[PDB]
Amino acid sequence: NDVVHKQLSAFGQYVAEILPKYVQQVQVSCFNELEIFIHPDGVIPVLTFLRDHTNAQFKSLADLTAVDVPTRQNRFEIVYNLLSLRFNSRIRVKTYTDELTPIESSVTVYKAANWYEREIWDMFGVFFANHPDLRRILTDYGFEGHPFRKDFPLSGYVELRYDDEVKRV
Amino acid sequence: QPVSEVGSRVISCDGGGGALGHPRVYINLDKETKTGTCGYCGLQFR
Amino acid sequence: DITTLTGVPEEHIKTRKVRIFVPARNNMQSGVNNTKKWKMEFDTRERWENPLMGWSSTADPLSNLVLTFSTKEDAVAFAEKNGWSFDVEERKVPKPKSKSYGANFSW
Amino acid sequence: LIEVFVDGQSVMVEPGTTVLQACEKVGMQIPRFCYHERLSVAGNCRMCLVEIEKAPKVVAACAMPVMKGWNILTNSEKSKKAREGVMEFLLANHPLDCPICDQGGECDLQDQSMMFGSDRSRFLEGKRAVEDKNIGPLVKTIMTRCIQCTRCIRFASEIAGVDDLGTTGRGNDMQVGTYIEKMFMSELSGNIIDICPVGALTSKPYAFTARPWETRKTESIDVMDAVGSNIVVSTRTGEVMRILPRMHEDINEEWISDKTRFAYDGLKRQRLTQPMIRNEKGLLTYTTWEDALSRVAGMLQSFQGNDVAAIAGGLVDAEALVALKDLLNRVDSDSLCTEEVFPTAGAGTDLRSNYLLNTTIAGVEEADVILLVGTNPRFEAPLFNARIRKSWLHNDLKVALIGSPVDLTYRYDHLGDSPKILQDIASGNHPFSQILKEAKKPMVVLGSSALQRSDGTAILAAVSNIAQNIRLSSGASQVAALDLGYKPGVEAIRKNPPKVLFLLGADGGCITRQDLPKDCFIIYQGHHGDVGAPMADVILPGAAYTEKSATYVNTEGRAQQTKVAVTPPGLAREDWKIIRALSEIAGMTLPYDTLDQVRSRLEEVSPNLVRYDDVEGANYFQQANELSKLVNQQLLADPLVPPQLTIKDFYMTDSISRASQTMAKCVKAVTE
Amino acid sequence: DMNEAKRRVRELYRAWYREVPNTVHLFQLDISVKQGRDKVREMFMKNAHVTDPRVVDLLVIKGKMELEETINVWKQRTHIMRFFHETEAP
Amino acid sequence: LGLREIRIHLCQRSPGSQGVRDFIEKRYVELKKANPDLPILIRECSDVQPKLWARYAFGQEKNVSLNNFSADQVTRTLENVLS
Ligand code: SF4
Ligand code: SF4
Ligand code: FES
Fold this sequence. Notes:
Chain C is largely without helices or strands.
């Protein structure tokens, strides 16, 4: 449909003008998916308004994905889906991040993001500032190296096995 | 197996039946000095 | 250097080397697509055989790993961020060549 | 250079040059078959059709040169309908053989069928199919899968130079198979297995054994020749499957030899696995690695100073030679003995350049005359023979044999006998000396075979004089050692020296065991039981070239390295590492231990080897080398016969090649 | 800058060291009570050459979580005995 | 006669090399005629500082670094070369 592509286009322009201290570009994937960019420092302020009405009542994170790419000056590339209800439609803001720079946590803005901060922390190196409690999930205890680092072998570097002489795995 | 022979020339071997055997292939018989073994079936022809 | 951050055992940031290169065209192919774009293959280690069934049982943690890139400098810098030993190799684009259907008919 | 528009953007393209080459320059890739650079253009297989910006009908992309601001819509719909149009025709008869055809993993015809060809079939009749044409020990012709991109004939007539095979008949029934049963053997016969577009021609020895998506594809270089061509070895997990050429402008350029292509097969058969001491009975017997190495480690201390005499094979091994070198200097005296009876007085070694092939082989096409003396180029170095033939078509430049009856593919002047025609032209007695005078950038090539022949030094002196004259008028296991001065290299130092140390006696062990009654003991650090092992006490298992990282030097002086592939077969280790163990046992532990520390030792003892692709040097200048050799000069003789002559003689050289099943099948093939 | 982070790590050593006997007690570990301490000191020597600014504080972030786990009885005898690599062939 | 070998390294383009480059086109043949004996390897190695190396039966090695020295100075250390 052309129509949706129109409305998303114009709306992308709309937000592009409303708050352009940080919207690097508002590309519309041709199959009707808008997606603006964000300077990594700018995460909270954008998303904040993204809940706040103008039309951007995009409540509820659908997810907090963390695409990786070995190239680029900063490899990890965070992504935020969002959904507005009354105007039933979805957008997708996203940023970028150094292996070492601590981007802030976005838990307060989208509310249901507490679990995700922990996820991406234990599936990646990236740290979220002002997060109440990053800690491991989806792993063993020690384990150490983050998976999903695009490098890092799927077979990992370790294995458990039970050993009778010490009577322990 | 006995070697099948036909007075014609080119023949098609499907390995027995339609869509239950190997892909249809035509075995040439340009040289009478040798049998025409099928690629998949393994059945000689002349 | 981020060696402490990665959980990787010291052995494999040490006693082995990456081997950056842009892959050669499979020569059976006439295609060119897969040729381009740097990748970051590691060196091979030992791989024996399963006493049973004859499988190629293998010890090394990370033999199969491989990574694409857009630019070589980015690749070298990449491994440097990892503190990796490396063997950078030149892109080896074929020289352009003259061609002429009529030169076949000089005399 | 003309401006031309690839679909949209302007491109300042080179004058003339085919539309295909234009889009190649923008990088967009036209579908192709019959065309191939490093071969020749042809109008068959019109899968390359592309649409002119304005002219209504499409033209073959590799045909028309670009000109005058042309625009060309590769993606234009009419082009696409054209391509589907052709592809349906190609697939109208190619037999349903994908699962069994050995080309199945990457046949270009498949991928072209995917990217462009319409998916529904709409042929609905009967494919033609044709009988096989047996051709030799190697290639497995199947035909029927043939699509008459003549290609292979354009390979044969224009590179192998043989024109035995060719097209036959008209319309359908026309066949690229050669008429008459006669077998087609040639030294470049192997490369067609690469060149063949589909599965119509694929290597018998490798056949069925594996599938393309499976095998890992290591990059390295050949060792069967010191020519040093780049390759892609391919292994199905822990075991080598098949070799293919890897293109490189300075050497192989997409081609490869043939003895090398099937050389790997010998690795699988007889090979060193465990150390083997002589027993009291004189039988070879399997042993622990440790007791053996400690045994000889103590054994060679008594003879510190001279006595002990290491002997390299013809294949080995840069890191092994530095390691063994310190083995020989930490011990007080030593035997740097190669194998080829290469003359050393007057020292071509110290100046480096005399044993170098001065012009790049890449520079060979620039030379306007070639002076081949003593040994035929094709058997000694096929890629070079391909190079000179390549220019032979590209240029009308002269060449000359000095001298043999050998059958090189192309027209060339034949001379007479060594001191005769050589010293005569050197003194300008030969008319040939004149044409050598007027010639631009003259090239004189002297084979390694000539360097022995009883009085090798005399032959070298004669050829050097010719080099001096031109200037006045104006207008393995070999080059590596001489990069590090292991001359004499010849075993002529003797003076019988007890406890010889083979790196590989499979080659020079055929000679004589004269030191053995004086000292039967011979450490043997080979990787086959061939020749050297049976007549040698204490056997050391050792790695083949696929495993070792060790560099080898191009005859040009390029010194590029092989990479690891499949690890040593058994208890065997990489060769040098045994020595770095040995010195450590002796108490004269060497400064290096890692491969890279000892690459730092190349970074001292040379340090020009640590420049893997860098042939260039300051050069000693030919006149200065001439003066350096001027003080010797000695009596000569007429005869000069190259070792190989026949191809069957070419099939067997180093012990690995005789361990080959398929090479044995070839030597049986040509002889029967 | 460095040093400001080094104090952090010393604090961390205090915490670990003092906690260790409780670890051996509560977990019924039969490691020599000293050995855990020594091994702690060693693990502290493992990165005793790191010199980057932010990387070290990040190191104490990853250092907190472990004492965080042993204090909460998260991980177990297996998981905490894991550090000693005791089953490995020399 | 302790020395077994001698070697020399020379980049083709550093200026500090030419005072040694000049040493080779002319002094060299004089040297070999003066030195039938032990090997005198020359290299075109592009090490920025040209060098000198000397083997013993001991395996110990002379290691003479040089910078932009006159060829006569090269000759000087070369005559300092002895048994
Ligand atoms: S190789 Fe010949 S047969 Fe095998 S798939 Fe490609 S085209 Fe079909
Ligand atoms: S031989 Fe190779 S190239 Fe010549 S037609 Fe048959 S397949 Fe095409
Ligand atoms: S290559 Fe253009 S016609 Fe086949």
